[PDB]
Amino acid sequence: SMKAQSIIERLAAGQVHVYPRSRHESEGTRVQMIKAEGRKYLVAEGSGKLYDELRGEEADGVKLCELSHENRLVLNRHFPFTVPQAFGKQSATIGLGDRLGIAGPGHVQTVRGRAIHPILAQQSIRELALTGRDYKQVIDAAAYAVFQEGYTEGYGADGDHLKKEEDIRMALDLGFTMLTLDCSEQIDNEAAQAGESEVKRKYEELPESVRSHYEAKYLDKTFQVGPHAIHFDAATLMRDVLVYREAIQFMIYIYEKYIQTAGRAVDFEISIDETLTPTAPGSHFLVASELIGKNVDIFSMAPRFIGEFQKGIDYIGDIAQFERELAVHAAIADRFGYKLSIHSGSDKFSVFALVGRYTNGRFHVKTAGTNWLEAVRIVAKTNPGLYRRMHQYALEHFEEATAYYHVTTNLNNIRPLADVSDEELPSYMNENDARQLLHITYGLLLQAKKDDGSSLFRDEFFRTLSEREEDYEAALRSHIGKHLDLLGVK
Numbered sequence: 001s002m003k004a005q006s007i008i009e010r011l012a013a014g015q016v017h018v019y020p021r022s023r024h025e026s027e028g029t030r031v032q033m034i035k036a037e038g039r040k041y042l043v044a045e046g047s048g049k050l051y052d053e054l055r056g057e058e059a060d061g062v063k064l065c066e067l068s069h070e071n072r073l074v075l076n077r078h079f080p081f082t083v084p085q086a087f088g089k090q091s092a093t094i095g096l097g098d099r100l101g102i103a104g105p106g107h108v109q110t111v112r113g114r115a116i117h118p119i120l121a122q123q124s125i126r127e128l129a130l131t132g133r134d135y136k137q138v139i140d141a142a143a144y145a146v147f148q149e150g151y152t153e154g155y156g157a158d159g160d161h162l163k164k165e166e167d168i169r170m171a172l173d174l175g176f177t178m179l180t181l182d183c184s185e186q187i188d189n190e191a192a193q194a195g196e197s198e199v200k201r202k203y204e205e206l207p208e209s210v211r212s213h214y215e216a217k218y219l220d221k222t223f224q225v226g227p228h229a230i231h232f233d234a235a236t237l238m239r240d241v242l243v244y245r246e247a248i249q250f251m252i253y254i255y256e257k258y259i260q261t262a263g264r265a266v267d268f269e270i271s272i273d274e275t276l277t278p279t280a281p282g283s284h285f286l287v288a289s290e291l292i293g294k295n296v297d298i299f300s301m302a303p304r305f306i307g308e309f310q311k312g313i314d315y316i317g318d319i320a321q322f323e324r325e326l327a328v329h330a331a332i333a334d335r336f337g338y339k340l341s342i343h344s345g346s347d348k349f350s351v352f353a354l355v356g357r358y359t360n361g362r363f364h365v366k367t368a369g370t371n372w373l374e375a376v377r378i379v380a381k382t383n384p385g386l387y388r389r390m391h392q393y394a395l396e397h398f399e400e401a402t403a404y405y406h407v408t409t410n411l412n413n414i415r416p417l418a419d420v421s422d423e424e425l426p427s428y429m430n431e432n433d434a435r436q437l438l439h440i441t442y443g444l445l446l447q448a449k450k451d452d453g454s455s456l457f458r459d460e461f462f463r464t465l466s467e468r469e470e471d472y473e474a475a476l477r478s479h480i481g482k483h484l485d486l487l488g489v490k
């Protein structure tokens with residue numbers, strides 16, 4: 001309370017940072033956001049239901065409030081623009097995942113004035129587990145970000161890479177507006193790699209009603225998808241049914257059980273991008289045709305594209321072949337009305353203009369870890385001693401993290417820390433292999449502890465990022481801005 005009294009008095013004296021776009025008003029209560037002693041606060045003043053419902057410390061007629069979950073729910077009630085919204089499938093969206101909870105404002109600053117809608121709250125179940133966070137905090141950070149920046153155009157919240165029904169129920173209960181269904185576990189990858197008589201053999205074990213449905217609809221048929229002809233012979237049809245049928249059934253089951261019944265608009269993304277086999281455009285057509293035939297309302301489809309989309313780096317593969325397949329993938333999406341979704345999209349600069357051109361600007365692209373790597377870059381620039389300790393720890397524990405993310409990192413390409421000066425440490429975050437090293441070890445680094453249980457890096461990491469808040473947000477504006485520019489946004 002003496003802490004709160006000090007802040008309130010210094011605010012009156014003009015000695016406390018006020019976020020200039022954060023001033024809002026509900027009935028007779030004025031609210032703004034400030035930063036004091038490395039922490040953000042809400043400041044409320046003026047009698048009213050908003051003042052009464054916020055929880056904080058009162059001095060003068062002024063209430064100083066922490067950025068708590070409960071106060072976020074109060075802001076949600078009085079300021080609808082702080083509540084996530086669905087967007088539908090006829091616009092551009094970017095997923096702006098934040099593993100740290102501090103990138104929201106920089107993300108908002110980047111999309112302000114651009115023709116794209118931000119999915120500002122986006123984290124996977126694995127990311128929550130590796131960071132020790134929950135979905136309430138992810139939406140909290142996004143809601144406070146749009147309030148801080150006075151961004152009233154609307155933001156979305158994505159329950160990313162959901163697999164279990166309990167997690168889908170949780171996402172819907174917590175107000176998420178985008179639901180990403182990971183169907184990788186239902187894909188029959190051995191059927192995709194098996195020989196072609198064995199495909200015919202496994203196919204013949206299916207019920208005749210199933211084989212009749214697919215053959216009557218696809219066998220020896222040609223579909224005109226714009227300038228692209230998609231033809232199914234028996235061999236391709238049988239393999240497609242074996243690889244995808246169980247996943248299709250799972251898509252329909254989830255849609256009917258949870259999406260159709262949600263009682264509000266939900267953007268439903270189907271994800272098959274973490275498959276071992278690439279999604280052939282013809283297989284994509286069959287999956288979409290079956291879903292659309294069953295009245296499933298799809299926001300986006302995330303196929304596995306030819307080549308590789310690894311974390312932290314640009315595309316691996318033959319970009320001419322990527323373009324040829326993208327042309328058909330994009331035509332299929334246009335035919336059925338949903339958008340293509342690009343996962344592991346950050347730093348894929350070689351594909352962005354193609355994606356923008358072939359989708360006519362109507363896409364979803366997801367990022368997350370690249371925003372963590374920009375925070376690491378700030379540490380390399382401003383706290384080299386901390387960077388060295390984090391980089392060395394990542395080297396020592398890298399194998400644990402490769403169990404969760406598939407990368408082909410060559411540690412032999414990374415200069416030893418003893419060979420690089422403090423001034424040169426930021427150059428690591430421009431290199432493929434060092435970027436992957438730090439990208440995938442975020443959970444191990446954030447949760448690392450000393451023998452007494454205190455944090456090994458996490459507290460000092462957030463301390464430097466708070467001290468360098470303006471540098472971090474300039475870095476996000478520049479880095480995510482480059483993504484949007486190459487995608488052709490606006």
Ligand SMILES: [Zn+2]
Pocket residue numbers: 161271273274343344
């Ligand atoms: Zn994915």
